[PDB]
Amino acid sequence: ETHETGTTNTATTATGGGTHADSLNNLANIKREQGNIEEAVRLYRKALEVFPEFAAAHSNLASVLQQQGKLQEALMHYKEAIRISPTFADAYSNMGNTLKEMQDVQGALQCYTRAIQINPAFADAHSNLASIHKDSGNIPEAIASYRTALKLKPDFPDAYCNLAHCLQIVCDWTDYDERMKKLVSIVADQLEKNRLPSVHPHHSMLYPLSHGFRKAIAERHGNLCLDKINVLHKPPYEHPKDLKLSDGRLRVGYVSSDFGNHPTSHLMQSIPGMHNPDKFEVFCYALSPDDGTNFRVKVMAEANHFIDLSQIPCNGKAADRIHQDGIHILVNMNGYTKGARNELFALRPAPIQAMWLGYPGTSGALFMDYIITDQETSPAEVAEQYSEKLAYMPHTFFIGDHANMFPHLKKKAVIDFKIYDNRIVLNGIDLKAFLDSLPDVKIVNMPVIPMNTIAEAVIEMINRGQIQITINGFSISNGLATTQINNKAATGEEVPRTIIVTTRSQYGLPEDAIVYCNFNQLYKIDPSTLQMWANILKRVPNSVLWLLRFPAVGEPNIQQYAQNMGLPQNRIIFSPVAPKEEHVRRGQLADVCLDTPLCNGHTTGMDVLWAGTPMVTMPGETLASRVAASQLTCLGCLELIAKNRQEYEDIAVKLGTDLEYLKKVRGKVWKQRISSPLFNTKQYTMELERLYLQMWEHYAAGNKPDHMIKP
Ligand SMILES: O=c1ccn([C@@H]2O[C@H](COP(=O)(O)OP(=O)(O)O)[C@@H](O)[C@H]2O)c(=O)[nH]1
């Protein structure tokens, strides 16, 4: 689940009418462009007092009311505009944008297609329709509609920028360098003319925008929330100045749209219950309804308090609830992601408000005080990228729930088909008892099942695509068929009950060569990165690159570019996206993971390391380009971090060419995923608590936020 693509409202210039009403409407349009929203509203309402049946003024007013979050009142005016003027295409397109924001995709499509039916040359409606295709996952149709819009209106920043991100999703790098310069130039122009930047904050990390531009895009996006809360005219809240009402406990509120089957929960679902109740009182504020999964069950049971704000959709009232609960530190787990209701933070119901874990960037906004990070991810020298003060965790700010979700991957055994650690692999909770039932098993620690009757039967189950067999009373599962056996084991909601078998043959990977993997969404790849990967493959004779169809339509673009850099097609192998458990388990088949420098694996980096797979990374400047080095520093593998592209290629080549070195580094990862802090949620929670108390003490003594960066 991605964010919703932004749309373009069309301001209608009034002509041919009474001078007074036309002038009021047109000047109102200008005041709206300048960010004088209230004054715009006053002017459209004067225009309507002068000429009650003024279709343009109804539609333009509705467009500013939509900006203010007054969606139902906006719809009322759009409909009045269309009643007065049934072929008013601007009003249908604008109404479309309002319906989209209300999550009525069908209504939005009905409005945009009506607009286009009225006026086929209406660029903005084509662009808005494009945004629906983009959000549906129909990239080729989104690209087509954005191209139509740009053909009709060649200077069209929202269309251009949303097109660029469509192209990024499918690794279309046609005219890439010129495209990157153009995005920078658009953003420069919009920041100068004080118009909302067409690059979304979350996407800004992918383009060679300056840090100040990235921060400024973030800020301007935060400012949208201000326009929505300003109409509530709510006074500042009075905050606790001590812990007396909470009996000496710090009240921490975790606000997320992701308490359910979402990557954020896959990272931090154990944290609420690990909080120490003698000093901390945990409130979890869900922005989404209960999705039925055990992720939601666990957080509901373990948190001291759970509060469903999806049932309190008015932001003023939701913020009042947070304030009534007495929260000292309110934690924004969303940032600029779908489901966020950053208006809640803009209302400042708590005295300390911190960004944490869910969003890999700055809010840019005055209403957030701190970003929870660490010295590797966010060295003080690069503080300019963030509006918040830095608040350092002692190792990495990243965490994962892999030890609780995937304990079956803490140990493995192999079958010696013919000794490799990653060709044919077994994992399971009863694996030890299964192996004790085979009298001929030998220990390397990694148990090895020799080629014997039992091993042949296992390999036969895999070769034939059978679901499972029973040997010696133990169920032995095909790793491709987990969802047919237990759907909750496949999603990570429960620990699998069978012994699962995972093989290179299941994914068409070679038995006698090095497998380099990357399991991120393809948008994280750029031309430099694929050239680096080709250089590595070229230096490691029969090695392959294992990527995902994420999405499948990017595959022929990656293959063509790879061919142009001298790789044959057979050197890159694509697999489908898998269920969570399979995705983590099958990383055990790779030799090495090659991290994406543009935007690293985050969740995906923790996934690969839980399998014992060394990851090679090159940290950049942005928070999103530095997370994997931070994970690796915490893990205790500094030799896997490159300072430049030559070193990343050399590290990866050496891992694929010196097999003793490979085994040594693999063994470090395998061991340190348990012995290091990286996956230790109890330790993590204890250090987060100390950080929270540093925040609180500083506030309680009467200070504004400061960087909390002391080694
Ligand atoms: O084959 C796959 C590949 C990925 N994932 C999961 O898909 C999500 C990818 O989210 P995102 O692209 O946000 O990951 P990040 O950017 O954090 O690495 C993560 O939860 C992965 O564990 C999956 O379940 N199956």
Numbering used by the authors: 297 to 714, 719 to 744, 763 to 1029
Copy text from the publication.
HCF1 is initially expressed as an approximately 210 kDa protein that is activated by limited proteolysis (protease maturation) within the proteolytic processing domain (PPD), consisting of multiple 20-residue repeats. A depletion of OGT leads to an accumulation of full-length HCF1 protein and the PPD is proteolytically cleaved by OGT via an unusual glycosylated glutamate intermediate. In the OGT:HCF1PRO structure, the peptide substrate spans the whole length of the TPR domain. The peptide interacts with the TPRs through some of its side chains, but intriguingly five regularly spaced asparagine side chains in OGT form hydrogen bonds with the HCF1PRO peptide backbone in a sequence-independent manner. We noted the fortuitous proximity of the HCF1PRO C-terminus to the OGT N-terminus (CαHCF1–1340-CαOGT313 approx. 12 Å), and wondered whether this would enable the direct tethering of substrates to OGT via a fusion linker to allow us to explore OGT-glycosylation substrate complexes. We first demonstrated that this fusion approach recapitulates the published HCF1PRO peptide binding mode and then used that to reveal how the C-terminus of the OGT glycosylation substrate TAB1 is recognized by the enzyme. Remarkably, this is also similar to the proteolytic cleavage site of a HCF1PRO repeat, with the major difference being a glutamate at the acceptor position. PCR primers (6H_HCF1_GGG_hOGT_fwd GTATTCATGCATCATCACCACCATCACccgccctgcgagacccacg, 6H_HCF1_GGG_hOGT_rev CAGGTTGTTCAGGGAATCAGCATGGGTaccgccaccggtggcggtggtggcggtg; 6H_TAB1_GGG_hOGT_fwd GTATTCATGCATCATCACCACCATCACGTGCCATACTCCAGCGCCCAG and 6H_TAB1_GGG_hOGT_rev CAGGTTGTTCAGGGAATCAGCATGGGTaccgccaccAAGGGAGAGGGTCACGCTGGTC) were then designed to introduce a TAB1 or HCF1 peptide followed by a GGG linker in place of the PreScission Protease site and the first two residues of the hOGT, changing the boundaries to 315–1031. Crystals grew in 2–3 days in 3.5 M sodium formate, 0.1 M Tris pH 8.5 for TAB1-OGT fusion and 1.3 M ammonium tartrate dibasic, 0.1 M Tris pH 8.5 for HCF1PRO:OGT. Crystals belong to space groups P6122 (TAB1:OGT) and P6222 (HCF1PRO:OGT) and have one molecule per asymmetric unit.
